[PDB]
Ligand SMILES: O=C(O)[C@H](CCc1ccccc1)CC1(C(=O)N[C@@H](Cc2c[nH]c3ccccc23)C(=O)O)CCCC1
Ligand SMILES: [Ca+2]
């Protein structure tokens with residue numbers, strides 16, 4: 052829409068109050084004009100037809116429960132845009148300020164979220180397994196990171212390259228969560244998963260095996276489900292990334308941690324300069340060592356920590 056930029060107030064999925072950027076033109080729309088070419092949030096109205104209607108509201112107050120998922124999808128996309136821009140100098144997902152679009156209320160009881168090659172899409176959850184998926188800042192950032200990858204390395208979504216694609220999204224979704232300082236951890240989707248059970252998540256980066264995912268290359272899933280286990284084998288990369296940042300001894304290999312900023316930056320450079328659609332784990336190791344080299348010098352600790360971490364998980 053064409054209108055006047057304004058600020059509204061609402062409540063997210065978890066009950067927290069936030070300000071959101073809106074546009075005024077008869078109605079108040081979920082259209083944020085302060086970020087690149089815009090952030091836009093749509094109502095899919097429990098249907099599967101995308102994107103749905105641009106979200107319209109009469110009074111600029113989004114306190115209704117049906118409003119919750121839209122508040123969070125809109126707000127978290129902003130934070131994620133901010134992260135890339137401020138931290139990595141990247142303007143939107145394509146590096147050229149593309150508009151960011153999300154739809155909420157997709158389908159009925161849909162326990163998932165996804166990037167469809169053009170926009171983000173969020174289900175409401177069935178109310179037991181998940182609550183509306185846009186309430187998790189790591190989920191929102193994992194999704195927007197698929198768009199970043201699509202525009203950069205272009206990692207094919209299957210087998211090793213697909214598990215690298217997944218680790219990327221979990222790594223950057225976790226860095227966005229620490230960035231916003233919203234109770235940060237090294238778990239994925241804890242805020243929206245099993246509202247009933249406290250303490251769990253979808254996946255663990257710190258200990259992938261907690262939920263049965265591999266944490267060593269020797270334990271790689273070699274079958275065909277999940278596109279050749281893109282959501283499984285990502286645990287091997289995730290654990291490497293956790294060790295680079297935090298440190299530790301894993302399978303007898305000791306890794307000194309270099310912290311999360313440095314982790315973000317080595318991975319961002321590997322992603323944007325070195326990785327290709329068909330990269331495998333072993334190529335991701337060469338890419339990460341080369342980025343850390345570029346950045347900190349050959350005889351650095353940073354380079355050393357990258358090598359140890361990949362040796363710790365069995366990659367090369
Ligand atoms: O982006 C992704 O990688 C996942 C998108 C998967 C998707 C792909 C194509 C069509 C529809 C859905 C969505 C997320 C994911 O990891 N989904 C997993 C785990 C999961 C979520 N809900 C589920 C319900 C059933 C089974 C698995 C799941 C999966 O689809 O495997 C990312 C973080 C939050 C949800
Ligand atoms: Ca209202």
Ligand SMILES: [Ca+2]
Nearest residue numbers: 233234235236
């Ligand atoms: Ca958290």
Ligand SMILES: [Ca+2]
Nearest residue numbers: 189238239240
């Ligand atoms: Ca998390």
Ligand SMILES: [Ca+2]
Nearest residue numbers: 244245246248
């Ligand atoms: Ca839970």
Ligand SMILES: [Zn+2]
Nearest residue numbers: 193197217220
């Ligand atoms: Zn994903």
